[PDB]
DNA sequence: CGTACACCTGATAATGGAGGATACC
DNA sequence: GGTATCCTCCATTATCAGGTGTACG
């Protein structure tokens, strides 16, 4: 069952807050405006899509998205205003997704008021939409050559509001990795390595830097192929002593929870030093095999 | 012997859309 | 008609998931 701050964290990590402006000559302006809250998970996490649905009052639909993914969506601007806006105004996002939530919100305010059915309000909404995802499409850019994107919200210095935020966030983005690495000097031939790891776009560097002080361990690394950061923990005593305890109280949601549990099992084998024997190494090979699986 | 940070790489589940039909005022 | 919501489908990239090298105790 789902706690408000965990929903916020999860959504900081996995939601999209979208606005669409679609050409259709049946509308007086030539355009139909639509606002959409969307969360898309692999089919193994349908359970979690139904919880969110339940959490948000039984509102919205769950549908097939990709070849093996499902979306939970709320596309009624009325429902978004009554149920989504009051939850996220009270329980705020702290990543750059907040910018998009704020812009998304002004679009709905303008829809509340029918200013979307006017030429000026529509132009406002297109400027807003322009700052939600790196611009407008080719088509909208040309329909609206005159629009200056609404400048993005200055979203300074946001602390982790609650431990459940982090449980939620790691549930969406976050990996409990088990590695077996060739070793020339270990007697059994392989080193058993546990890594805790959060990936995020480099835009969220502040958040990523706050993870170090919040958990009292780890370090940031930049991916050399593009603008993405890793928060990494590889020190095993920080794993045993900080990360495992944290996620024991503040549990991961979705199927990834089964992965945390197996990673914990690997860690117990490591604490006892059984990873240094043939038997323990095989236990670990078998646990690692069933992770990302079932 | 064994560990841990700095560095490396490929695969795909999310990111963030899209369009058509239908329901509703 | 005008407007709002439901439904079905998709290209790319933000992750996610494996490694490796080698200094150091
Ligand atoms: Ca994410
Ligand atoms: Ca965005
Ligand atoms: Ca994710």
Automatic annotation (TrEMBL):
Mg(2+) 3 binds at residues 14, 172. Residues 8-107, 166-266 form the Homing endonuclease LAGLIDADG domain. It comes from the Eukaryota. This is Homing endonuclease LAGLIDADG domain-containing protein. GO terms for molecular function: endonuclease activity; metal ion binding. Ca(2+) 3 binds at residues 14, 173. The keyword Glycosyltransferase does not apply. Mg(2+) 1 binds at residues 13-14, 173. Ca(2+) 2 binds at residues 14, 172-173. Mg(2+) 2 binds at residues 13, 173. Keywords: Calcium, Metal-binding. Ca(2+) 1 binds at residues 13-14, 173. Ca(2+) 4 binds at residues 100, 132. Mg(2+) 4 binds at residues 14, 173. The chain holds residues 120 to 413 of 432 of the full protein.
